[PDB]
Design an enzyme around this catalytic site. Structure first.
Site, PDB file in Angstrom:
ATOM      1  N   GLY A  11      31.230  41.412  55.002  1.00 23.51           N
ATOM      2  CA  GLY A  11      31.562  42.804  54.796  1.00 23.51           C
ATOM      3  C   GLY A  11      32.688  43.317  55.661  1.00 23.51           C
ATOM      4  O   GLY A  11      32.783  44.527  55.866  1.00 23.51           O
ATOM      5  N   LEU A  92      31.881  39.098  36.692  1.00 24.94           N
ATOM      6  CA  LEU A  92      31.230  40.113  35.857  1.00 24.94           C
ATOM      7  C   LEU A  92      31.539  39.931  34.363  1.00 24.94           C
ATOM      8  O   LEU A  92      32.624  39.503  34.007  1.00 24.94           O
ATOM      9  CB  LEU A  92      31.627  41.514  36.324  1.00 24.94           C
ATOM     10  CG  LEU A  92      31.267  41.875  37.762  1.00 24.94           C
ATOM     11  CD1 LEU A  92      32.273  42.887  38.337  1.00 24.94           C
ATOM     12  CD2 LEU A  92      29.841  42.422  37.796  1.00 24.94           C
ATOM     13  N   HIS A 108      41.794  39.959  46.705  1.00 30.33           N
ATOM     14  CA  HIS A 108      41.873  38.496  46.640  1.00 30.33           C
ATOM     15  C   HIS A 108      42.795  37.900  47.722  1.00 30.33           C
ATOM     16  O   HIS A 108      43.917  38.356  47.863  1.00 30.33           O
ATOM     17  CB  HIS A 108      42.362  38.075  45.271  1.00 30.33           C
ATOM     18  CG  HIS A 108      42.479  36.594  45.113  1.00 30.33           C
ATOM     19  ND1 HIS A 108      41.390  35.788  44.880  1.00 30.33           N
ATOM     20  CD2 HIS A 108      43.552  35.769  45.185  1.00 30.33           C
ATOM     21  CE1 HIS A 108      41.786  34.534  44.785  1.00 30.33           C
ATOM     22  NE2 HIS A 108      43.091  34.492  44.979  1.00 30.33           N
TER      23      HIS A 108
END
Length: 200
Positions: A11, A92, A108
């Site tokens: 995170g 997804l 990315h």
């Protein structure tokens, strides 16, 4: 704008987004943090910031559509405008991506279109580039292939490992992802109807 961040690990990107959305004149607020994995440090960072969290374990779903629907249910519960993928590791499905078109960003760790995939640094090292970088892009169905918002070049040092190169690129990530979130949340940067980025 109300923002959800999806994560699957540490995170550190989440953290830069938290700090940034709380600087003055922010157009965004982080209202929910969702992990597909339990016990990752990103959940602690969210909770320590006073931000609600959910663990939606992808292994408990028959397919991606149903896993995505559970995510989408929480996003509605939280009246979310923009979703940020920050070290989120699940691809997804079409309908979810279609629903969030122009409202979902990903970070990315390469200069797309080079080194698509989750092991970009490993590709960068094998390939022998001296310059790599990071990219914030709108999320499209094709992995790591949506429209580019911001990029930043990061040198590769002779003798870099995956870890040293990863750390250097993370410092750039923590700059461009917040900046890109602000651009989208303010309506400065939009996905145009023709599927092309437009600046207002």
């Amino acid at each position: 704008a109300r923002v959800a961040v999806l994560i699957s690990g540490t995170g550190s990107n989440l953290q830069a987004l938290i700090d940034s959305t709380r600087e003055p004149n922010s157009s965004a607020q982080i209202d929910i943090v969702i992990s597909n994995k339990a016990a990752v440090a990103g959940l602690d960072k969210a909770e320590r910031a006073g931000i609600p969290t959910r663990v939606i374990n992808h292994k408990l779903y028959k397919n991606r559509v149903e896993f995505d629907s559970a995510i989408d249910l929480v996003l509605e519960e939280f009246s979310i405008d923009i979703v940020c993928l920050a070290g989120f590791m699940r691809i997804l499905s079409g309908p979810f991506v279609q629903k969030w078109n122009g409202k979902m960003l990903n970070i990315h760790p390469s200069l797309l279109p080079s080194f698509k995939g989750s092991n970009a640094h490993e590709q960068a090292l094998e390939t022998g580039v001296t310059v790599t970088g990071c990219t914030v892009h709108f999320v499209a169905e094709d992995v790591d292939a949506g429209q580019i918002i911001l990029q930043e070049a990061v040198p590769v040092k002779r003798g870099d490992t995956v870890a040293t190169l990863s750390e250097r690129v993370k410092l750039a990530e923590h700059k461009i992802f917040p900046a890109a979130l602000q651009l989208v949340a303010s309506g400065t940067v939009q996905l145009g109807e023709n599927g092309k980025i437009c600046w207002v």
